[PDB]
Amino acid sequence: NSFSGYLKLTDNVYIKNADIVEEAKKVKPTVVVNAANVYLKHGGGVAGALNKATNNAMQVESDDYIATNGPLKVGGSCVLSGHNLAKHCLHVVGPNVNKGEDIQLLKSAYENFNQHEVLLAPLLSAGIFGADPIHSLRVCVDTVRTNVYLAVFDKNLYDKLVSSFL
C-alpha cells in the first residue's frame, strides 16, 4: 500500500494516470480489484491484462473457483489470491450495460469495495462493459466509503475525470 503520485479527489478516492498492472507489481497492495465477468474468464480489458501479468495463474485458480462454487452474480464479488500482484484479488462484476444489464447494479458492484480498508482498482463497467467512465467515477464516489486508489491507463480519460471532478 505504498502508493505514490496520486491526486486526492474526495476524503477517500485517489486517482493516478497509471497502468494498474505496473502499480500492482511495484506496490504489492493488500487488495487489487479485477473488473471481472460472472464466469471469471479473463479474456480482455483489465482482466486480460491482470491475468497475463500472472502468466495465467489467475485463470487456473479462477476456473477451479467456478467449478466448485459456480458463477458470480452481476454486482457480486469473490476474493482469490493476488499471486505476484497483491496479497488478494477482489474479482468484482459490474453490469455490462451493452448487453442490457442494469446500470443500477454498478452501485452494488462498488459496494463490495467497502469490505476492504484499502484497494488498488480500475473504473468498473467502463471500457468493454460500455458504461460512461465519468458516470462510473461518480458512482464510485457516491458509494465507496473505504480508501480507493484508482489507476486510469488512458491519459485523455484521466485528464477528463480530473477536470470533471475538480
Ligand SMILES: O=C(O)[C@@H]1CCC[C@H]1c1ccc2cccnc2c1
Ligand atoms: O483506465 C482506463 O483507461 C480504462 C478505463 C476502464 C478500464 C481501464 C483499463 C486499465 C488498464 C488496462 C490495461 C489493458 C487493457 N485495458 C485496460 C483498461
